[PDB]
């Protein structure tokens, strides 16, 4: 159904045949980033639920794979699995907790 | 020595034509497909090739079959060793049996 990530297709009739108009999705403008497989926070290894960890140089964000939409790393979009002594390439960062400012106010 | 079969085919009007792509060109295509698979994943077949580390690409592959990606990162050396052993088994089977 065409080259790229397929979205839709439309048929057209032709003599002794058929013509398909394949509508696809093609990524356009890439950008280099620094990435890590996991985030070490409080002695716990955090992995992204959906997406990928990226860094613009100073701060770390989590974004979806096919579109650069950076978001703050939070326990909602990450899950915890084990400690930091096993994963190769794990980096140190903080993970935001939404419950603490709601409890403080 | 003696007359060949190919010479007797040639002398009677039967001719074998060479293919358009040589074996070096097929090897170039195969090496390009392998390098794009290793260094980009599936991204080079749907557009431009975007680099990704091979452990993270393999975690994407594990996530595609219904296994969480901490399973790869907590068992990375075992999976690498199993892959290397299976490639060596393919080497042994190709050097041993030709059927
Ligand atoms: C990323 O880095 C490579 C080498 O450092 C460079 O050739 C390339 O232009 C950079 N940008 C993109 C979008 O790939
Ligand atoms: C991450 O933090 C721990 C303690 O918080 C420290 O022992 C370790 O060296 C740090 N890792 C890096 C790469 O700085």
mmCIF file of C-alpha atoms in Angstrom, chain A residues 8-95:
data_model
loop_
_atom_site.group_PDB
_atom_site.id
_atom_site.type_symbol
_atom_site.label_atom_id
_atom_site.label_comp_id
_atom_site.label_asym_id
_atom_site.label_seq_id
_atom_site.Cartn_x
_atom_site.Cartn_y
_atom_site.Cartn_z
ATOM 1 C CA UNK A 8 -5.415 5.748 3.039
ATOM 2 C CA UNK A 9 -5.874 4.433 -0.487
ATOM 3 C CA UNK A 10 -8.264 5.387 -3.287
ATOM 4 C CA UNK A 11 -9.191 3.224 -6.295
ATOM 5 C CA UNK A 12 -9.547 4.519 -9.834
ATOM 6 C CA UNK A 13 -10.768 2.489 -12.791
ATOM 7 C CA UNK A 14 -8.468 2.085 -15.796
ATOM 8 C CA UNK A 15 -8.660 0.162 -19.093
ATOM 9 C CA UNK A 16 -7.996 -3.535 -18.319
ATOM 10 C CA UNK A 17 -6.865 -2.668 -14.804
ATOM 11 C CA UNK A 18 -7.082 -0.574 -11.656
ATOM 12 C CA UNK A 19 -5.114 2.398 -10.296
ATOM 13 C CA UNK A 20 -4.497 2.848 -6.563
ATOM 14 C CA UNK A 21 -3.747 6.276 -5.085
ATOM 15 C CA UNK A 22 -1.788 5.373 -1.955
ATOM 16 C CA UNK A 23 -1.620 8.110 0.692
ATOM 17 C CA UNK A 24 1.366 7.692 3.021
ATOM 18 C CA UNK A 25 3.165 9.468 5.867
ATOM 19 C CA UNK A 26 6.811 10.452 5.364
ATOM 20 C CA UNK A 27 8.976 12.027 8.111
ATOM 21 C CA UNK A 28 10.762 15.146 6.918
ATOM 22 C CA UNK A 29 13.179 17.096 9.142
ATOM 23 C CA UNK A 30 15.349 15.100 11.530
ATOM 24 C CA UNK A 31 17.548 16.425 14.324
ATOM 25 C CA UNK A 32 20.360 14.820 16.308
ATOM 26 C CA UNK A 33 19.812 14.136 20.004
ATOM 27 C CA UNK A 34 21.586 12.465 22.909
ATOM 28 C CA UNK A 35 19.642 9.504 24.267
ATOM 29 C CA UNK A 36 19.729 7.032 27.159
ATOM 30 C CA UNK A 37 17.959 3.698 27.725
ATOM 31 C CA UNK A 38 16.878 4.452 31.307
ATOM 32 C CA UNK A 39 16.839 7.128 34.012
ATOM 33 C CA UNK A 40 18.349 6.404 37.431
ATOM 34 C CA UNK A 41 16.318 8.182 40.116
ATOM 35 C CA UNK A 42 16.408 7.382 43.867
ATOM 36 C CA UNK A 43 18.173 4.100 43.164
ATOM 37 C CA UNK A 44 15.434 3.003 40.756
ATOM 38 C CA UNK A 45 15.575 2.436 37.003
ATOM 39 C CA UNK A 46 12.861 4.282 35.067
ATOM 40 C CA UNK A 47 11.856 3.249 31.541
ATOM 41 C CA UNK A 48 9.515 5.186 29.221
ATOM 42 C CA UNK A 49 6.007 3.787 28.818
ATOM 43 C CA UNK A 50 5.726 4.842 25.191
ATOM 44 C CA UNK A 51 8.427 6.928 23.582
ATOM 45 C CA UNK A 52 12.132 7.610 24.028
ATOM 46 C CA UNK A 53 14.400 9.647 26.304
ATOM 47 C CA UNK A 54 16.195 12.523 24.558
ATOM 48 C CA UNK A 55 18.384 15.409 25.673
ATOM 49 C CA UNK A 56 19.019 18.798 24.083
ATOM 50 C CA UNK A 57 22.278 19.136 26.026
ATOM 51 C CA UNK A 58 21.196 20.147 29.528
ATOM 52 C CA UNK A 59 17.696 18.818 30.285
ATOM 53 C CA UNK A 60 16.193 15.419 29.486
ATOM 54 C CA UNK A 61 12.778 14.934 27.893
ATOM 55 C CA UNK A 62 10.567 12.052 26.794
ATOM 56 C CA UNK A 63 9.056 12.203 23.307
ATOM 57 C CA UNK A 64 7.270 9.939 20.865
ATOM 58 C CA UNK A 65 9.345 8.176 18.244
ATOM 59 C CA UNK A 66 8.028 9.592 14.955
ATOM 60 C CA UNK A 67 7.555 13.253 15.950
ATOM 61 C CA UNK A 68 9.656 15.531 18.146
ATOM 62 C CA UNK A 69 7.270 16.513 20.959
ATOM 63 C CA UNK A 70 9.381 16.835 24.122
ATOM 64 C CA UNK A 71 7.709 16.434 27.507
ATOM 65 C CA UNK A 72 8.855 16.598 31.123
ATOM 66 C CA UNK A 73 9.854 13.215 32.558
ATOM 67 C CA UNK A 74 7.190 12.273 35.106
ATOM 68 C CA UNK A 75 6.089 9.074 36.879
ATOM 69 C CA UNK A 76 2.938 9.114 34.706
ATOM 70 C CA UNK A 77 4.906 8.531 31.483
ATOM 71 C CA UNK A 78 7.541 6.238 33.044
ATOM 72 C CA UNK A 79 7.539 2.934 34.905
ATOM 73 C CA UNK A 80 9.948 1.502 37.472
ATOM 74 C CA UNK A 81 11.787 -1.804 37.038
ATOM 75 C CA UNK A 82 14.671 -2.806 39.284
ATOM 76 C CA UNK A 83 17.726 -0.792 40.274
ATOM 77 C CA UNK A 84 20.463 1.052 38.390
ATOM 78 C CA UNK A 85 23.167 -1.644 38.629
ATOM 79 C CA UNK A 86 22.053 -3.692 35.604
ATOM 80 C CA UNK A 87 21.193 -1.363 32.677
ATOM 81 C CA UNK A 88 24.089 -0.449 30.375
ATOM 82 C CA UNK A 89 24.028 3.250 29.539
ATOM 83 C CA UNK A 90 21.741 4.450 32.346
ATOM 84 C CA UNK A 91 22.066 8.140 33.253
ATOM 85 C CA UNK A 92 21.276 10.183 36.361
ATOM 86 C CA UNK A 93 18.277 12.525 36.371
ATOM 87 C CA UNK A 94 15.230 13.478 38.418
ATOM 88 C CA UNK A 95 11.658 12.336 37.745
#
